[PDB]
């Protein structure tokens, strides 16, 4: 079964990904030398908590507080927490679309908490990665895969009504789910994901998962190819597969990252190096890596730099107890 180290690892990895990623958000300019330089500077900063979190963590904290409060999953409670969190701290770096959902949820006009999301972008719904960026904790709370799928979907559908948005969230939740389940081989991990997403989609996400397989069978794949084929975007389709690739790639040495950085550190460094939506791709790859390698790879020097590290650790313990209760 899942250990405390794994739940702690997942959440801290997600926080690190968000906080460190934020440095480089929306940049066509990022290459690995800058990330390594940034990390060296980070690891000798005298003050703790210099890196502030973004919408990624803010929404993550709301998910977690909903699961703890309503462990059978209460989407009305979760929507309320998203909307109140936004209201309290609107400048955290939210999507331009999703702001309209929060205001609609805060008004007394909607009895149906899914309806604001359905109305997004001319009724097509958002295909953004905001559903996925906050979903890891679903997989940390619910052992059963069928729960992980349905609750990933519903948590996502509060903001992301498009199949790309909510299926992106399911994929990210499944990636954490399967990373939790033993030191599972690379090839087993992927088989599991492709299997599930083929059933769920039918295939955009499956297509990208197959590309990941291809890339992982080659060596020294340029980052240009990864960005071209997988993306580094705010779209779920162009970020969730990318996060998964970053996790899988960094299970082995990358010749450009010193091997004195552990696998989780490597994963975060590599993720950020891909550019674009650096906070979300790194928060997602970091959640998966955290679940896989556990808290042993979340180094004191790194975690101390993050806003809300203590609260995050505390919430990991609470999530672990929820998980244990569900067995
Ligand atoms: N269906 C769509 N049609 C046109 N544009 C879309 C559509 N769906 C999403 N987008 C674009 O994607 C952006 C983000 O989607 P939203 O639902 O607003 O927000 P969300 O996915 O939470 O944003 C995640 C980002 C990740 C970082 O940029 C900060 N937060 C929108 O403001 C649009 O620009
Ligand atoms: Mg962000």
- Going 75 to 79 to 80 to 85, the CA torsion angle's sign is positive
Q: From the CB of 280, is ligand 1 less than 6 Å away?
A: yes
Q: What resolution in angstroms does the PDB record give?
A: 2.0
Q: From the CB of 132, is ligand 1 less than 6 Å away?
A: no
Using CB atoms within 10 Å of the CB of residue 92, give its burial: 0 to 12 exposed, 13 to 18 middle, 19+ buried: middle
Q: Any idea what DSSP says for residue 276? A: B
Q: From the CB of 127, is ligand 1 less than 6 Å away?
A: yes
Residue 68 and residue 319: Cα distance in Å, rounded?
A: 7
How far, in Å, from the CA of 319 to the mean position of ligand 2? 22
CATH of 1-327, one of 3.40.50.300, 3.40.50.2000, 3.30.365.10, 1.10.4080.10: 1.10.4080.10
Query: Is 296 within 8 Å of 10 (Cβ atoms)?
Result: no
**Token representation of residue 250:** 């960094």
How far, in Å, from the CA of 230 to the mean position of ligand 1? 17
How far, in Å, from the CA of 129 to the mean position of ligand 1? 7
Ligand in nearest proximity to the CA of 26? 1
Tell whether 296 is in a known binding site: no
Query: Is 172 within 8 Å of 243 (Cβ atoms)?
Result: yes
Tell whether 125 is in a known binding site: yes
What's the distance, Cα to Cα, between the start and end of the chain in Å?
Answer: 9
Alpha-carbon separation of residue 305 from 232, 274, 298 (angstroms) = 25, 22, 12
User: Which residue has tokens 């500077």?
Assistant: 41
Among 128, 132, 232, the mutation site with the greatest number of ligand 1 atoms within 8 A of its Cβ is: 128
Q: How was this structure determined?
A: X-ray
Please name which of 211, 216, 243, 214 lies closest in space to residue 229, comparing C-alpha atoms: 211
Tell whether 294 is in a known binding site: no
Residue 143 and residue 22: Cα distance in Å, rounded?
A: 31
Q: From the CB of 93, is ligand 1 less than 6 Å away?
A: yes
Q: Give helix then strand counts, H and E, for the chain.
A: 18, 0
Residue 15 and residue 10: Cα distance in Å, rounded?
A: 9
Tell whether 95 is in a known binding site: no
């Amino acid at each position: 079964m899942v250990s405390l180290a794994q739940v702690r690892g997942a959440l801290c990895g997600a926080l690190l990904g968000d906080c460190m990623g934020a440095e480089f958000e929306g940049s066509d300019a990022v290459e690995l030398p800058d990330v390594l330089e940034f990390v060296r500077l980070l690891e000798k900063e005298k003050k703790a908590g210099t890196l502030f979190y973004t919408d990624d963590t803010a929404m993550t904290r709301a998910v977690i507080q909903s699961l703890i409060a309503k462990p059978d999953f209460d989407e009305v409670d979760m929507a309320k927490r998203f909307a109140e969190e936004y209201k309290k701290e609107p400048t955290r770096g939210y999507g331009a679309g999703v702001v309209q959902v929060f205001k609609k949820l805060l008004s007394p006009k909607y009895s149906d908490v899914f309806q604001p999301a359905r109305e997004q972008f001319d009724g097509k719904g958002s295909y953004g990665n905001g559903g996925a960026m906050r979903v890891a904790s679903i997989a940390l709370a619910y052992p059963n895969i069928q729960d992980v799928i349905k609750f990933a979907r519903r948590s996502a559908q509060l903001t992301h009504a498009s199949p790309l948005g909510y299926n992106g969230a399911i994929l990210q939740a499944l990636a954490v789910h399967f990373a939790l389940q033993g030191e599972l081989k690379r090839d087993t991990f992927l088989e599991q994901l492709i299997g599930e997403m083929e059933r769920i989609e039918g295939l955009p996400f499956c297509s990208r998962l197959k590309k990941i397989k291809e890339f992982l069978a080659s060596s020294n794949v340029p980052k240009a190819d990864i960005v071209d084929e997988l993306g580094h975007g705010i779209a779920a389709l162009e970020s969730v597969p990318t996060a998964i690739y970053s996790f899988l790639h960094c299970m082995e040495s990358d010749p450009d990252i010193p091997d004195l950085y552990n696998n989780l550190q490597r994963t975060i460094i590599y993720s950020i190096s891909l550019g674009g939506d650096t906070d979300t791709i790194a928060t997602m790859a970091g959640a998966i890596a955290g679940a896989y390698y556990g808290m042993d790879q979340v180094t004191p020097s790194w975690k101390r730099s993050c806003e809300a590290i203590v609260e995050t650790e505390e919430s990991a313990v609470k999530l672990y107890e929820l998980y244990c209760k569900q067995l």
